Design a protein around this motif. Structure first.
Motif, short mmCIF file in Angstrom:
data_model
loop_
_atom_site.label_atom_id
_atom_site.label_comp_id
_atom_site.label_asym_id
_atom_site.label_seq_id
_atom_site.Cartn_x
_atom_site.Cartn_y
_atom_site.Cartn_z
N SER A 40 -26.45 -44.94 -9.07
CA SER A 40 -25.26 -44.55 -8.30
C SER A 40 -24.11 -44.16 -9.23
O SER A 40 -24.18 -44.44 -10.43
CB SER A 40 -24.87 -45.60 -7.26
N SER A 41 -23.12 -43.44 -8.71
CA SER A 41 -22.05 -42.91 -9.55
C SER A 41 -20.65 -43.34 -9.16
O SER A 41 -19.69 -42.94 -9.81
CB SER A 41 -22.15 -41.38 -9.59
N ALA A 219 -40.03 -40.49 -11.35
CA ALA A 219 -39.62 -41.86 -11.71
C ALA A 219 -38.10 -41.91 -11.93
O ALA A 219 -37.56 -41.30 -12.85
CB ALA A 219 -40.35 -42.34 -12.95
N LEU A 220 -37.42 -42.61 -11.05
CA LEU A 220 -35.99 -42.84 -11.16
C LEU A 220 -35.78 -44.14 -12.01
O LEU A 220 -36.43 -45.15 -11.75
CB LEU A 220 -35.43 -42.99 -9.74
N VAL A 221 -34.94 -44.10 -13.07
CA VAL A 221 -34.69 -45.29 -13.90
C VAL A 221 -33.39 -45.92 -13.39
O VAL A 221 -32.29 -45.46 -13.70
CB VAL A 221 -34.74 -45.02 -15.43
N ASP A 222 -33.53 -46.92 -12.51
CA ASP A 222 -32.44 -47.58 -11.77
C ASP A 222 -32.13 -49.04 -12.21
O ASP A 222 -32.77 -49.99 -11.75
CB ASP A 222 -32.76 -47.52 -10.26
N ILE A 228 -39.67 -52.55 -9.27
CA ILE A 228 -40.34 -51.28 -9.48
C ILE A 228 -40.71 -50.93 -8.02
O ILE A 228 -41.22 -51.77 -7.27
CB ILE A 228 -41.58 -51.41 -10.42
N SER A 229 -40.37 -49.72 -7.60
CA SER A 229 -40.66 -49.30 -6.24
C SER A 229 -41.32 -47.93 -6.20
O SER A 229 -41.03 -47.08 -7.03
CB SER A 229 -39.39 -49.32 -5.38
N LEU A 311 -37.88 -47.36 -11.27
CA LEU A 311 -38.15 -48.36 -12.31
C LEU A 311 -36.91 -49.21 -12.49
O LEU A 311 -35.93 -48.76 -13.09
CB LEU A 311 -38.59 -47.68 -13.63
N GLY A 312 -36.91 -50.36 -11.83
CA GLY A 312 -35.79 -51.29 -11.82
C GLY A 312 -35.90 -52.37 -12.87
O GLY A 312 -36.57 -52.17 -13.89
N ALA A 313 -35.26 -53.53 -12.62
CA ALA A 313 -35.21 -54.67 -13.58
C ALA A 313 -36.59 -55.15 -14.06
O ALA A 313 -36.70 -55.55 -15.22
CB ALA A 313 -34.41 -55.82 -13.01
#
Ligand SMILES: COCCCOc1cc(C(=O)N(C[C@@H]2CNC[C@H]2OC(=O)NCc2ccccc2)C(C)C)ccc1OC
Ligand SMILES: *[C@@H]1O[C@H](CO)[C@@H](O)[C@H](O)[C@H]1NC(C)=O
Length: 336
Positions: A40-41, A219-222, A228-229, A311-313
């Motif tokens: 998010s921004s 792959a979004l690096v969030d 991981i979703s 790709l989360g925590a």
């Protein structure tokens, strides 16, 4: 403009699901626990103007503009929608302190904050680390305002997310990376397009065989996401391969069968990024009579960003991540 300064923000690791730091807003500073979110921004904190009928505003720190001498009014409405819920409020300007760096920033004063999921939030607000292209009301993101100061050694920021405790929860370096938290060398993957922290994924393999994302996927690096979703269909195939049962919000395996689960590999750039069951199972027990949650969830992300993996925590714990604004790329290295 490039300077000689790097700034760090120490993070708190709550249960391996929430990672947040501290920021100050106004004069004198009002401190908030915030998530540094690459997905998010916008910068937002809960407002004093939030109805106390929203229980989330009773349990979080509220920003009171009437107590800040550096506050500048705006009032433009804003609504930020996420996969988990929605927040609304209005725009305000004030001085934000982020690890030593003092910056005049426009942010959202949230007046509508739902119990689901914000009653489960340990953090008060969000500090979006995304690009202006994804900013609601095209508000300048905090990193763009920090770059403008020309104080940072490099136009990059890095994330370290530790495995739960009592020591260091994590660390964000603004202006560089911290070699004490990675080993080997970074391997970069270029962004598909500027404006989104998203890269191309060549395939996802369960065990040894490339079971998913065979023809390629996103792959979004969030950093603001716990897990991981993948898409509902992707996660269905993944879980069938793991022997997992679908529940209301999560997938589970019996605790005893947790350690036996196969490795999950993500093909990004040249390299294969492998997680073992120890990296994706909340191994709370070893009992055949108990259910253990997996740190992988289904999340249908809509266009233009989706359908995409995130790709989360779960991923960042294993791989120290560098976000390169100068070269529109993301670097990964094995976390120490
Ligand atoms: C790792 O510790 C961080 C905190 C984890 O705990 C929580 C996170 C959230 C949450 O969901 N977010 C917002 C997401 C992350 N970025 C994008 C957005 O989700 C999408 O909507 N993702 C899909 C997407 C992403 C980008 C573009 C389009 C769609 C918080 C506000 C930062 C809600 C409740 C939580 O705890 C009770
Ligand atoms: C609020 O901030 C935006 C920044 O783009 C500005 O254009 C707008 O005129 C401001 N509104 C008020 C009422 O100050």
């Amino acid at each position: 403009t490039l300077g000689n300064t790097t700034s760090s923000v120490i993070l708190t690791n709550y249960m391996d699901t929430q990672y947040y730091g501290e920021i100050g807003i106004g004069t004198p500073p009002q401190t908030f626990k915030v998530v540094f979110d690459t997905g998010s921004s916008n910068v937002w904190v809960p407002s004093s103007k939030c109805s106390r009928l929203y229980t989330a505003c009773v349990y979080h720190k509220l920003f009171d503009a009437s107590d800040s001498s550096s506050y500048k009014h705006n009032g433009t409405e804003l609504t930020l929608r996420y996969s988990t819920g929605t927040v609304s409020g209005f725009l305000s300007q004030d001085i934000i302190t982020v690890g030593g760096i003092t910056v005049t920033q426009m942010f959202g004063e949230v007046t509508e904050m739902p119990a689901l999921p914000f009653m489960l939030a340990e953090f008060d607000g969000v500090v979006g680390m995304g690009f202006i292209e994804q900013a609601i009301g095209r508000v300048t993101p905090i990193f763009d305002n920090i770059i403008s100061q020309g104080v940072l050694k490099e136009d990059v920021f890095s994330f370290y997310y530790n495995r739960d405790s009592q020591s260091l929860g994590g660390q964000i370096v603004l202006g560089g990376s911290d070699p004490q938290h990675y080993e080997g060398n970074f391997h970069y993957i270029n962004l598909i397009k500027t404006g989104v922290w998203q890269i191309q994924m060549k395939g996802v393999s369960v065990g040894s065989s490339t079971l998913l994302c065979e023809d390629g996927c996103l792959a979004l690096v969030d950093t603001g996401a716990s897990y991981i979703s993948g898409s509902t269909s992707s996660i269905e195939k993944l879980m069938e391969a793991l022997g997992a049962k679908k529940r209301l919000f999560d997938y589970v395996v019996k605790c005893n069968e947790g350690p036996t689960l196969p490795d999950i590999s993500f093909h990004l750039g040249g390299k294969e990024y492998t997680l073992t069951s120890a990296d994706y199972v909340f191994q709370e027990s070893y009992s055949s009579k108990k259910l253990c949650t997996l740190a992988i969830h289904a999340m249908d992300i809509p266009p233009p960003t989706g359908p995409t993996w995130a790709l989360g925590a779960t991923f960042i714990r294993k791989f120290y991540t560098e976000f390169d604004r100068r070269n529109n790329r993301i670097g990964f290295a094995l976390a120490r």
